[PDB]
Every structure is written in structure tokens, then in C-alpha cells.
Coordinates of C-alpha atoms and ligand atoms in Angstrom, one line a residue:
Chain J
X1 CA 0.0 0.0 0.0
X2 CA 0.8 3.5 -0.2
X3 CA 1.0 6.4 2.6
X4 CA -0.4 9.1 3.9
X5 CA 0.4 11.9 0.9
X6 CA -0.9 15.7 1.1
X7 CA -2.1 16.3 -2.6
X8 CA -1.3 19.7 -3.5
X9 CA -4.1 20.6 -6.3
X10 CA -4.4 23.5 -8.4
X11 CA -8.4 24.4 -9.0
X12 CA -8.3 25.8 -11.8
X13 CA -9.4 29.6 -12.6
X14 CA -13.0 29.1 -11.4
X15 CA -15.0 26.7 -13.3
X16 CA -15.3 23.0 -11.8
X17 CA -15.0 21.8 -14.6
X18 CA -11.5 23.3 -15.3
X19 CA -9.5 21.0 -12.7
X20 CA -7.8 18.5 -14.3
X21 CA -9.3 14.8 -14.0
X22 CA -6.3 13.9 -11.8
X23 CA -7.5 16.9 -9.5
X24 CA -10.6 15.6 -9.3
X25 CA -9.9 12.0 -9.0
X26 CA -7.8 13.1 -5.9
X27 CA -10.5 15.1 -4.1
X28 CA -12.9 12.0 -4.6
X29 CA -10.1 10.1 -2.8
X30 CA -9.2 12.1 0.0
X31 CA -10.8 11.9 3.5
X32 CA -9.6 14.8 4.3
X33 CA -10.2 18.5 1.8
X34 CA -8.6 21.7 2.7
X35 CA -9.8 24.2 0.8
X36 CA -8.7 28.0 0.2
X37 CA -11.1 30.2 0.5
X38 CA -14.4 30.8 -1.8
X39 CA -12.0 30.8 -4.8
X40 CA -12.2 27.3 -4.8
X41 CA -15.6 26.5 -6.4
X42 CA -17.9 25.0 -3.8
X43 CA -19.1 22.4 -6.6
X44 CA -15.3 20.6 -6.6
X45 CA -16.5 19.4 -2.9
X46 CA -19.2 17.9 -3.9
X47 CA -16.6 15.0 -5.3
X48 CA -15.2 14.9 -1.6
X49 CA -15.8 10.8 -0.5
X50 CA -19.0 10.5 1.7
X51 CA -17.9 11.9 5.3
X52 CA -14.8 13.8 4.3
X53 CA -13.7 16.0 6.7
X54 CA -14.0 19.4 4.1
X55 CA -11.8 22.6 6.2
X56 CA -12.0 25.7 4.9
X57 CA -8.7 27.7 5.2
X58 CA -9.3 31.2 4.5
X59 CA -9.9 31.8 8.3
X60 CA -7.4 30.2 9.5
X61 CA -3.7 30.8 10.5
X62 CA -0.3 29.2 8.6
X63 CA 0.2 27.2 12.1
X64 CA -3.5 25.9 12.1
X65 CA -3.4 25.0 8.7
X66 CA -0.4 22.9 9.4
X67 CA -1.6 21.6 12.9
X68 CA -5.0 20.6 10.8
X69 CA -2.6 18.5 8.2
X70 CA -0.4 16.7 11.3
X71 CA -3.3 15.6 12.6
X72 CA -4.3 13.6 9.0
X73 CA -0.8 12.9 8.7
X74 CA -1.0 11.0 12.9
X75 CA -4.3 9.5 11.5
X76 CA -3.1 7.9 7.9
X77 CA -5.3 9.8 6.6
X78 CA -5.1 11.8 2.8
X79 CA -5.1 15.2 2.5
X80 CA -6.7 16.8 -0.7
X81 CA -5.4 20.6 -0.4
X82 CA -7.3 23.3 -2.7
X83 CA -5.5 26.1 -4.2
X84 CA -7.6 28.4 -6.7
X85 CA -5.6 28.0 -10.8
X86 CA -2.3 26.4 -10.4
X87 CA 0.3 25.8 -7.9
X88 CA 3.3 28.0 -9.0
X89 CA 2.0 31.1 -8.9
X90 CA 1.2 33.1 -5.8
X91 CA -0.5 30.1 -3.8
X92 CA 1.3 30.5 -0.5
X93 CA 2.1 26.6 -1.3
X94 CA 5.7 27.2 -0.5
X95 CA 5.7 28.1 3.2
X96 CA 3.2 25.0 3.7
X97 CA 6.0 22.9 2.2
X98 CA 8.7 23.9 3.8
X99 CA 6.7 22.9 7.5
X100 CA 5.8 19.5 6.2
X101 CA 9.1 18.7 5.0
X102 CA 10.4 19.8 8.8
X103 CA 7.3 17.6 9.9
X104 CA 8.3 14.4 7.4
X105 CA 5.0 14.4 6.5
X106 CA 5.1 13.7 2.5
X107 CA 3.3 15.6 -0.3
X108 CA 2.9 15.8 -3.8
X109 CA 2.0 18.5 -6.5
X110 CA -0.9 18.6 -9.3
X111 CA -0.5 21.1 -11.5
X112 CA -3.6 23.4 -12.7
X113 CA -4.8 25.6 -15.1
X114 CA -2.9 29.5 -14.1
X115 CA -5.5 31.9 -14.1
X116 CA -3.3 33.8 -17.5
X117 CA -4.4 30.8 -19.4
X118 CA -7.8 31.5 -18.7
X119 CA -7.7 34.7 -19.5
X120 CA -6.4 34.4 -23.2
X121 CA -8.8 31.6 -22.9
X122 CA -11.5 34.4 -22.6
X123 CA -9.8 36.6 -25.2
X124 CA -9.9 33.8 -27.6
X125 CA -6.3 34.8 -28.0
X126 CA -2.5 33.1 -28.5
X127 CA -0.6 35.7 -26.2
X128 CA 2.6 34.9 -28.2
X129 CA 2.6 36.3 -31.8
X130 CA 5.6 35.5 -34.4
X131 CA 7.2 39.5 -35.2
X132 CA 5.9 40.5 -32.3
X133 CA 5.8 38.5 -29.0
X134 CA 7.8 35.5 -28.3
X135 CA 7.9 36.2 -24.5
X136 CA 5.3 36.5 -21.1
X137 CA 5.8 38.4 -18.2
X138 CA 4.0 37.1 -15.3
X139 CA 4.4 39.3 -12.6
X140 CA 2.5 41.8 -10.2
X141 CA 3.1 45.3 -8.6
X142 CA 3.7 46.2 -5.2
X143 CA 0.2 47.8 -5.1
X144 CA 0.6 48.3 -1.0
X145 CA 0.8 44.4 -0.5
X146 CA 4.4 43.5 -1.2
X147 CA 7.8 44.7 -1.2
X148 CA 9.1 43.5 -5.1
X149 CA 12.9 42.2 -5.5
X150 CA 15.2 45.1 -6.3
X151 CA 15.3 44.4 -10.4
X152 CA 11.2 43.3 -10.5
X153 CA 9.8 46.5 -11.5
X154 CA 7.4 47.5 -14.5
X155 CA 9.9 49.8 -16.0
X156 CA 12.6 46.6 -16.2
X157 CA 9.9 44.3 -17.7
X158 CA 8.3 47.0 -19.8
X159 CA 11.9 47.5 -21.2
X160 CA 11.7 44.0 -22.6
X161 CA 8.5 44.9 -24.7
X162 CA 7.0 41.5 -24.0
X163 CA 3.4 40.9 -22.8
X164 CA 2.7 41.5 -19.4
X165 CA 0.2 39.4 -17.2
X166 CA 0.2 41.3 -14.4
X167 CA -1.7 39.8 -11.4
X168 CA -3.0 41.3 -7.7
X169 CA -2.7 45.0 -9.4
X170 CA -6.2 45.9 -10.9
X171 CA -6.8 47.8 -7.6
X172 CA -4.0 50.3 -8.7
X173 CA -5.0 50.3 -11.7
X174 CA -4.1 53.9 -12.9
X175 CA -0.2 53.9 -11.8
X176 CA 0.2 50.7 -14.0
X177 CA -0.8 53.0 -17.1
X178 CA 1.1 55.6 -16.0
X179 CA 4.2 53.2 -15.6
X180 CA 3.6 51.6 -18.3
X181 CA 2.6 54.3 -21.1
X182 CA 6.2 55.8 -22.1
X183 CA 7.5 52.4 -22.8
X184 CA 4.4 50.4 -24.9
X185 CA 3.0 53.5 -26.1
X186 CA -0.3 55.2 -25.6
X187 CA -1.8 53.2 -28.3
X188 CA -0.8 49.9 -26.8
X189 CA -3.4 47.2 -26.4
X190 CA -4.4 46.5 -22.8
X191 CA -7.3 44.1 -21.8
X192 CA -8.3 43.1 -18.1
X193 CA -10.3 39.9 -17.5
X194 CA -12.5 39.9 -14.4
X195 CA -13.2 36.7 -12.8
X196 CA -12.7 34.7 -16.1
X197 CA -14.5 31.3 -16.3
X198 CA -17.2 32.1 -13.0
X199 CA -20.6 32.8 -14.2
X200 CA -19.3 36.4 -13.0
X201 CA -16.8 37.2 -16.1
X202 CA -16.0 40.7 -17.4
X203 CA -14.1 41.5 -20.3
X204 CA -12.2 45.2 -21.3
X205 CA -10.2 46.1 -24.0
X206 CA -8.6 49.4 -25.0
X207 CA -5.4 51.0 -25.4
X208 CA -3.5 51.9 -22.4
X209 CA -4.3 55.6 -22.8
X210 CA -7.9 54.7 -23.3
X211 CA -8.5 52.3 -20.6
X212 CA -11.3 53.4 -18.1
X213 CA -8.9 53.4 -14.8
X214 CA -12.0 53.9 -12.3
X215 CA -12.7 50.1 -13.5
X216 CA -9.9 49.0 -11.4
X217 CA -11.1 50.7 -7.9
X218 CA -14.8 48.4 -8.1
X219 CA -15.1 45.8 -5.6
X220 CA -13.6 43.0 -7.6
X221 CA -10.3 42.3 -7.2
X222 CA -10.2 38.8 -8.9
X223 CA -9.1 40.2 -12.6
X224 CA -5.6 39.6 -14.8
X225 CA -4.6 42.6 -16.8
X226 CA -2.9 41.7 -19.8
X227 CA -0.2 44.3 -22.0
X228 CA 0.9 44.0 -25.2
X229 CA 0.4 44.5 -29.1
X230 CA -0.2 40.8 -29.6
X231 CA -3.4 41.5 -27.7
X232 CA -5.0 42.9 -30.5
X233 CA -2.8 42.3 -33.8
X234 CA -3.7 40.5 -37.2
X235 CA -0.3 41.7 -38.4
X236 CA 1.7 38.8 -37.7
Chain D
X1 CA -21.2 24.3 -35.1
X2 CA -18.4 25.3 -33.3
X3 CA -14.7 24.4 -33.1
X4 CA -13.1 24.1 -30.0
X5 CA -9.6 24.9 -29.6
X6 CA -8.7 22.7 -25.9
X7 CA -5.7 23.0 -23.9
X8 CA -4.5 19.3 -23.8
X9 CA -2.2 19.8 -21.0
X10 CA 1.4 18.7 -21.0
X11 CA 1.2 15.0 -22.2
X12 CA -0.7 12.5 -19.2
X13 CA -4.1 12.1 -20.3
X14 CA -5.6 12.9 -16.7
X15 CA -4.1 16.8 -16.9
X16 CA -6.5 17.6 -19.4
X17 CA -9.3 19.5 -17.5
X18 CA -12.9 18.0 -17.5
X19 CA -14.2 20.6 -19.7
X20 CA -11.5 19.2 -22.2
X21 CA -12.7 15.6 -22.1
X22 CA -16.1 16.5 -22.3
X23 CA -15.6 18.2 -25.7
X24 CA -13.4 15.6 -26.9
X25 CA -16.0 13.3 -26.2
X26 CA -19.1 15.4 -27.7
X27 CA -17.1 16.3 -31.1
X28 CA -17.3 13.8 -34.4
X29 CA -14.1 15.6 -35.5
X30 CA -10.7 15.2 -33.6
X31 CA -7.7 17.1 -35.3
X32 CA -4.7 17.1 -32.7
X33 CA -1.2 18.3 -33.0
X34 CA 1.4 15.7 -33.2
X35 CA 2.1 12.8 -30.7
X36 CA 2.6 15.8 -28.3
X37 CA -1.0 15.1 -27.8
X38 CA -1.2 11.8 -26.0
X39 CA -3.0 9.1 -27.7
X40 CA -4.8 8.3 -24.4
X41 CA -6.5 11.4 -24.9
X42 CA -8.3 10.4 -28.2
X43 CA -9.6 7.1 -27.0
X44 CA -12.7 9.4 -25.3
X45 CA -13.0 10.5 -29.0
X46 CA -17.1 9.5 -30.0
X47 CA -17.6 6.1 -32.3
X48 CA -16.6 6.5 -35.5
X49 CA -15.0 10.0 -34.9
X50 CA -12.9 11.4 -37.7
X51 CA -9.4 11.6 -36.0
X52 CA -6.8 13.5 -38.1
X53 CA -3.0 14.0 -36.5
X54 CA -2.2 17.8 -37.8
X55 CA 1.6 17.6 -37.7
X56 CA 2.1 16.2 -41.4
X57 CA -0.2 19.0 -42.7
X58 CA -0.6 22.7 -43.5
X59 CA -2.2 25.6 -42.4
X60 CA -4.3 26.1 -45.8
X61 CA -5.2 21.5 -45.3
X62 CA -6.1 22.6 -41.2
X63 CA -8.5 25.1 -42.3
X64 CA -10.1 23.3 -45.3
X65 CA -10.6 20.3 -43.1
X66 CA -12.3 22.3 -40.8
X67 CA -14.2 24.2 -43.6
X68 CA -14.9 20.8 -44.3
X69 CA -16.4 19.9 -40.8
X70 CA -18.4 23.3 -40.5
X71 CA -20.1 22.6 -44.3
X72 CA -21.1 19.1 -42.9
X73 CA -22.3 20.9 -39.1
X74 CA -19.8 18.7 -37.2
X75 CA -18.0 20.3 -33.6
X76 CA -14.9 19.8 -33.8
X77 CA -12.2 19.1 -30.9
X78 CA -9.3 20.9 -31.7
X79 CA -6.3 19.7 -29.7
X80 CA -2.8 21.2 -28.8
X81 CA -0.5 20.6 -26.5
X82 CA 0.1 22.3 -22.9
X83 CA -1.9 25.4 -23.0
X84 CA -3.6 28.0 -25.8
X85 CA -2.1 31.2 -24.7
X86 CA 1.7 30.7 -25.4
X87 CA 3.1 29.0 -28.8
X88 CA 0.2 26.9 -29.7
X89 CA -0.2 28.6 -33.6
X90 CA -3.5 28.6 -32.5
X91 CA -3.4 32.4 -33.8
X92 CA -2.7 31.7 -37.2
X93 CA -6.0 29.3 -37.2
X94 CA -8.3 31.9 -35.7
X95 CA -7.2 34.3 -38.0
X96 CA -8.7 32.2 -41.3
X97 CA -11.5 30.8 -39.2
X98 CA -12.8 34.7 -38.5
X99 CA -12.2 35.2 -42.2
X100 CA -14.4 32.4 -43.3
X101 CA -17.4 33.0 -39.8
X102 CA -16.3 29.4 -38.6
X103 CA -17.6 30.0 -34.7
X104 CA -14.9 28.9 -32.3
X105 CA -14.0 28.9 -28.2
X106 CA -11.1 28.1 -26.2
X107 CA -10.6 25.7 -23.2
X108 CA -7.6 26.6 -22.1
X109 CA -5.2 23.8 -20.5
X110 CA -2.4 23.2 -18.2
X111 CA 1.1 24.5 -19.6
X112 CA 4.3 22.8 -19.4
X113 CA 5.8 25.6 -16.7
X114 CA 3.2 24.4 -14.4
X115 CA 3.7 21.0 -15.0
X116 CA 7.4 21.4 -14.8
X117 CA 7.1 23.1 -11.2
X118 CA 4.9 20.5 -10.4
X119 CA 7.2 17.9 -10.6
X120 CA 9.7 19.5 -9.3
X121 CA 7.0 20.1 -5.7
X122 CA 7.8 24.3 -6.5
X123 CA 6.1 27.1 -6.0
X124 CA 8.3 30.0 -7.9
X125 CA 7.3 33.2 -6.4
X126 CA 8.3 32.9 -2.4
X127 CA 7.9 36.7 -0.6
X128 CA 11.5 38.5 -0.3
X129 CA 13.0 36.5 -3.3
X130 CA 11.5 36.3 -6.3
X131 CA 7.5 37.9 -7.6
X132 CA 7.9 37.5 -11.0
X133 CA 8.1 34.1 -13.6
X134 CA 9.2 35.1 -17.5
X135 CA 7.6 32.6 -19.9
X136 CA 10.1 32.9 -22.5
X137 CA 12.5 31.0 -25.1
X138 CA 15.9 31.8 -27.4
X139 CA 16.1 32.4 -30.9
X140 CA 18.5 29.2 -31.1
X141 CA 18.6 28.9 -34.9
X142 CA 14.6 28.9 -34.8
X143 CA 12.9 32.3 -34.8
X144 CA 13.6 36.0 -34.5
X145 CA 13.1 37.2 -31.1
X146 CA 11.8 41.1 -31.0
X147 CA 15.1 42.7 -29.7
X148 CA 13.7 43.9 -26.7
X149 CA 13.8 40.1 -25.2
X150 CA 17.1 39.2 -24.9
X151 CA 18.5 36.2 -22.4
X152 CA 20.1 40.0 -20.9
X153 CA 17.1 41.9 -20.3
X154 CA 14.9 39.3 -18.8
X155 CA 18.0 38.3 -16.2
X156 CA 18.4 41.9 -15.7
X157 CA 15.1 41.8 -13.3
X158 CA 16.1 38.5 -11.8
X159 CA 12.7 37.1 -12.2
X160 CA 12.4 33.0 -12.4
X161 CA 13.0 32.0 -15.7
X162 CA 11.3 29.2 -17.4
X163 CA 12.7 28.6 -20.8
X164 CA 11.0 26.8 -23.7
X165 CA 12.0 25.7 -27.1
X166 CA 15.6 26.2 -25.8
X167 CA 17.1 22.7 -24.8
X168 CA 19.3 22.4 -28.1
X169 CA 21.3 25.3 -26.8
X170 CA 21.6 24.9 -23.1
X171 CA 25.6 25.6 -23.3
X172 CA 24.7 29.0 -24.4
X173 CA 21.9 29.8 -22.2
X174 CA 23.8 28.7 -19.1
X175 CA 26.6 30.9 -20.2
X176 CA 24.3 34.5 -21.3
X177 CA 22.9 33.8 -17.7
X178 CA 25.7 33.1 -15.3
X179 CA 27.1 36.8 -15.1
X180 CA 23.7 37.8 -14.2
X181 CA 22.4 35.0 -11.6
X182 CA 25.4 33.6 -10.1
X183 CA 27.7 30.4 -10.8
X184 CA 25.2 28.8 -8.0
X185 CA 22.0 30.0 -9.3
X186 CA 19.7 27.1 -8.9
X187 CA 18.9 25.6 -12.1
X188 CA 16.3 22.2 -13.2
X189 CA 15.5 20.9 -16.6
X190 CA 12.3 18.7 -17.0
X191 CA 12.8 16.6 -19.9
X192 CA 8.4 15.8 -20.7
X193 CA 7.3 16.3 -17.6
X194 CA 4.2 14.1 -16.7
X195 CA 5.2 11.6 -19.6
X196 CA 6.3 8.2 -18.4
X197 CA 9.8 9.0 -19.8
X198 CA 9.9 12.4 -17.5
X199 CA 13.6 13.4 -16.6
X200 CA 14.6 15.3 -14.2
X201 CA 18.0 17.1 -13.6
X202 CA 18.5 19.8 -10.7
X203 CA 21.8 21.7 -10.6
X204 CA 23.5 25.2 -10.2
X205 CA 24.4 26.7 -13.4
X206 CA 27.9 26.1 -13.2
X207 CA 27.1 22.7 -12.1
X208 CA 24.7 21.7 -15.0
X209 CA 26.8 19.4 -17.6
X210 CA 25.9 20.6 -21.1
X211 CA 18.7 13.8 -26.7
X212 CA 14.8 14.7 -26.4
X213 CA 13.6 18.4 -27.2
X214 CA 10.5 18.4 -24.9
X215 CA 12.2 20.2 -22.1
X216 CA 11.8 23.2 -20.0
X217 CA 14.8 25.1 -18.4
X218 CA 13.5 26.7 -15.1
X219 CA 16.6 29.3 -13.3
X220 CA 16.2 30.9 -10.1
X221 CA 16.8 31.1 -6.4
X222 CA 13.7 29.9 -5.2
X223 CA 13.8 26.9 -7.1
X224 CA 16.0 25.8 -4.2
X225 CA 15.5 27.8 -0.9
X226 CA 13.4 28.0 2.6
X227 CA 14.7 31.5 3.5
X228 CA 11.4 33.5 2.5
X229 CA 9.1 35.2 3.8
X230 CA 5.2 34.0 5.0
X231 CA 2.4 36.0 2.8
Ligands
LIG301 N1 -10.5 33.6 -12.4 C1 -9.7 34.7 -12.5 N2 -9.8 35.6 -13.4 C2 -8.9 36.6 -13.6 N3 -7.9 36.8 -12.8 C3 -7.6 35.9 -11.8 C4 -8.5 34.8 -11.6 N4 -8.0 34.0 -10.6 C5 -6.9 34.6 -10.1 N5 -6.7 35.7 -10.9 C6 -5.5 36.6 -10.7 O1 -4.6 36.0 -9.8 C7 -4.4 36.8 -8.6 C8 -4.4 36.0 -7.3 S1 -2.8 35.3 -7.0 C9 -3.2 33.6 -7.3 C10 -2.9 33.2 -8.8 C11 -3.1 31.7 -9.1 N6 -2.2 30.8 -8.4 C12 -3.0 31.4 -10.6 O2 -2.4 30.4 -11.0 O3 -3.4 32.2 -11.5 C13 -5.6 37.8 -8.7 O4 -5.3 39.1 -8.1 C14 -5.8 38.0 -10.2 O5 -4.8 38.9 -10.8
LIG302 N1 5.7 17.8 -21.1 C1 6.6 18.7 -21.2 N2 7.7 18.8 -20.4 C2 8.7 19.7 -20.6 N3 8.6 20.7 -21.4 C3 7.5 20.8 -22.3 C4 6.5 19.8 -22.2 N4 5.6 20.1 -23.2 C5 6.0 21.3 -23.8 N5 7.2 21.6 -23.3 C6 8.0 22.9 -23.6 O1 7.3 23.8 -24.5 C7 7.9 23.8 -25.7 C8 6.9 23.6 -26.9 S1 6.1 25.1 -27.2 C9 4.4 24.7 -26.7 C10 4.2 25.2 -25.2 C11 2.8 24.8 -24.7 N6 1.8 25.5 -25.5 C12 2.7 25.1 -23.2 O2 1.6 25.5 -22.7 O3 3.6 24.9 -22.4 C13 9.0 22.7 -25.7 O4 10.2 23.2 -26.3 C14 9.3 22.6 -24.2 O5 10.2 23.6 -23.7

């Protein structure tokens, strides 16, 4: 037989139905579901086994978190752990690893679908264009909720010319244009997906001197802007 | 009818989402993209489904056999591998599909960065060392890159790198990088990540020791580090 293993599972952007089978398959095996927040749908626990133990994290602490894995881990018991589009990105998945690894409890990683991929998915677009983009940015600003590494600034990236898919930002919105404008141009293509794949999904496209930046301080928070002439070029 | 462009993930049949496998199995017309697309994968393909392997063929034979398919009212399951967003030629398709009103959507997919990082059990942004992932690739005898990305510019910011297309010139990647990350910069290569032939090598970049194509080059501290921050 096999042990106890905490299954790491990227979500997916929104959608139950964009987890991967494996994800899926997992959660219907798992005893025990930890979940992160409402940004895990609430129909993926419905594949939970019949009297799963289903935790949701968002209120709770790094050290509870952990506490609530040992005690699965003491049990034998499987952990299915829920982490809205995939793993890589900004999941906090890190810091958990690093206390199970000190705990020798094991683990394992499904990947998911990044929450970028869904938004091109909702553009109907191929971010990377021959002639013009053969590169992605995926990054984020400061936006009063992180210090950035010294050379991680929009100036350095926007230097590059490549597409940016910058995440955790729409709430400041308006110095991202204003950052972003000397370098891309004022006629650059910019489009923001909000909430892409949930039955809530909003779409905008302009030019960065064109974009409606009051759009950014609405309560949603949950939306990808993406920079770049690729966005919305046939000349390729 | 529509065509639908899906994300087939990077290679294991069970990392295509649901919504994938659902249209694969709803569409009398398969056209998937090279044995990058895991048989598996077209087994949930309907009886008697017209399966056609696009690698041998042209744009202009794609979009007629889809003109095809739309003439006779058939869905179509348009496969590629990893994800849509990042060099799929999906473009190219859409294009001449707008240009004839041939209705389409996208399911986007799992891409080979994620599955890479995956495998490796990685997160790649960790607070106080690195916020930022560049999805990129080298020219390497293959395209022309727009001169703004450059191996230079992109290790300029220090961001993780995750390197595609770019396995054929590893010697000269490792050397464009080391002035910028270090001789001990962190470095892994997954060789088809997810396949059952996955490789996995982790290194430093002086360390790495310069033959499949199907790899991804990931460089960066975190790849390798527990001094970060919580978030
Ligand atoms: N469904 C969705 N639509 C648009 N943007 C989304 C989204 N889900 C997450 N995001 C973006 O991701 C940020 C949270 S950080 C978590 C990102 C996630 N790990 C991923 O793989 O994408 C948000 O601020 C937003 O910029
Ligand atoms: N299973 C896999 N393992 C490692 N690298 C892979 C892979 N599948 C694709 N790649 C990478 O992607 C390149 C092909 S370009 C296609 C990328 C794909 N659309 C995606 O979403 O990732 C290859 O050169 C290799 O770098």
C-alpha cells in the first residue's frame, strides 16, 4: 500500500470543470479536503468521498493550517489541499511545504490551469505572436501588499517589450498605465479579464491611454490585466 | 457548429481538464497536434470519430478540413499541446477561421511551466525572493526574437525563468545567464514532464553538464531555498 500523501491541487481559474481529471480523482479520494477560501468552487466538494472532513482555510492561521494537516498525517489519513488556478504562482504553497518537509509528512504537486491561461482563454487569444511576442511576463506590482525584488519592477519588464500578465494589481490600476505608457505607447493594447470562467466574467479592451482606470477601484479584485500589441494584432 | 480549440495539458491524459474531455468526447471531428497530444486522450474521442494528427499537414489543409467539418455541421475538438495562450499557432487558425465566420471557443489547458514546477513540488514566487516568472524562449537557430527580449534583459530583473524551445542550446543559455544569476544560481530541466519517460535534472548553473527536445529550463533562487518570507 501506499501512505499518507498531502495532494497539493491547483483548482483551476473558477469553473469546476477546469480541474484537471487527476484533481478531481484526488479530491474523490481524500478523506480529508482543505480548501482556500471561496476561490475554490464549492461544486469541486461535492466530489469529496462521503464523510470527508471538508476545512476551509481562509480563516485560519499558517500554524493551524499545518496543525489541521499533522493531525491527518497521525491519522493515515489523505489530505486533498485546494489552491484556486495552479500551484506555481502566488498560492502560498511554498511556506506549507517547507513545515511539512520539517514535519516528514510527504506531499505531492498537481498542477492546474494559471489563471493567464484562462484569461487568453476568454480573449480567444495566442498571447505569443511571431514578429511580435515571443515572450510572457507574469508578474505583479507592489500595489501596498508587497515589497518586489530590487530588479522586479514594470519599468525593467516593460523594457523588454514582452506581454505583461500582471496579477494582484487591478486595484491600482491607474499607476500601471502611468508606468507603463512611455514604454508600450499610448496606443498599446491593454485588456483586463475579471473573474474569467465564473458565471461572473467581465471582459475590457482598450489602449493603455484609453482604458477606463475607475474600473480597477470596483469591488472586484479577482481580474488579470494583460499588456501587449499581440493582444490585439492580425499583423503577424 | 463550433470548433473548439482545448488546452490538452502537457502530455498525461488525466491533466486535461474536465471541460477538455467532455468536448473531446461530444465532437465527431478530432484534429490534434502531433504525438505531443497523448493518444490516451483520443480514445474518449465518439464512435466512429474522424481523428486527423495535424503535424504532417498545412495551415491552408487545417482550415479546409475544418471548412470541411463546418459545411457538414460537425464540432470539432481541436487539440494542442500544454496550454492556448503561449506557442500553440493557435493564432494563425483563428485568424482564417474569423475570415471564413467558422464560430470557435477556447478551453484553455495546463502548460508545461506548471507542470514542470509541479514535478519539481515548487512554488516559484516565495515573498523576499523572487515575484515574477518570464515565460520565455531563445532564438537558437529557430525564430527571430523582438530585440527587446534578450536572455540579458529578462536576467536583468532576476525574475524566475522558465525557458522553452531552448534545450538544443543549453551551453549558451547557461553561459548569457551566469554573469547575471550567479555560478550557483539554482537551475532544473524537465525533460516531458508528466510523460512516463519524465527526466529530471536539478543543478546550479555552473554545475549543469551541457537527446529529447521536450524540455523546459526553469533558473532561479527559489527553485532551491526555505529563506522567504510568509504571505
Ligand atoms: N478567475 C480569475 N480571473 C482573472 N484573474 C484571476 C482569476 N483568478 C486569479 N486571478 C489573478 O490571480 C491573482 C491572485 S494570485 C493567485 C494566482 C493563481 N495561483 C494562478 O495560478 O493564477 C488575482 O489578483 C488575479 O490577478
Ligand atoms: N511535457 C513537457 N515537459 C517539458 N517541457 C515541455 C512539455 N511540453 C512542452 N514543453 C515545452 O514547451 C515547448 C513547446 S512550445 C508549446 C508550449 C505549450 N503551449 C505550453 O503551454 O507549455 C518545448 O520546447 C518545451 O520547452
Amino acid at each position: 500500500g501506499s501512505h499518507m500523501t498531502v495532494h497539493f491541487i491547483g483548482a483551476g481559474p473558477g469553473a469546476a470543470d477546469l480541474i484537471t481529471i487527476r484533481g478531481r480523482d484526488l479530491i474523490a479520494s481524500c478523506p480529508v479536503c482543505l480548501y482556500a477560501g471561496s476561490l475554490v468552487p464549492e461544486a469541486l466538494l461535492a466530489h469529496c468521498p462521503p464523510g470527508a472532513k471538508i476545512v476551509n482555510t481562509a480563516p485560519m492561521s499558517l500554524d493551524a493550517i499545518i496543525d489541521t494537516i499533522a493531525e491527518a498525517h497521525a491519522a493515515g489519513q489523505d489530505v486533498a489541499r485546494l489552491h484556486s488556478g495552479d500551484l506555481s504562482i502566488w498560492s502560498a504553497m511554498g511556506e506549507q511545504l517547507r513545515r511539512l518537509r520539517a514535519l516528514n509528512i510527504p506531499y505531492d504537486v498537481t498542477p492546474g490551469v494559471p489563471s493567464f491561461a484562462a484569461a487568453a482563454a476568454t480573449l480567444g487569444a495566442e498571447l505569443t505572436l511571431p514578429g511580435v511576442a515571443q515572450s510572457v511576463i507574469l508578474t505583479r506590482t507592489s500595489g501596498r501588499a508587497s515589497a518586489m525584488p530590487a530588479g522586479e519592477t514594470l519599468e525593467n519588464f516593460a523594457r523588454t517589450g514582452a506581454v505583461l500578465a500582471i496579477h494582484l494589481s487591478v486595484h491600482v490600476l491607474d499607476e500601471v498605465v502611468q508606468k507603463l505608457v512611455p514604454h508600450y505607447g499610448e496606443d498599446c493594447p491593454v485588456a483586463i479579464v475579471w473573474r474569467a470562467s465564473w458565471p461572473d466574467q467581465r471582459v475590457v479592451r482598450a489602449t493603455l491611454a484609453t482604458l477606463q482606470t475607475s474600473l480597477g477601484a470596483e469591488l472586484e479584485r479577482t481580474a488579470l490585466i494583460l499588456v501587449g500589441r499581440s493582444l490585439a494584432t492580425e499583423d503577424f
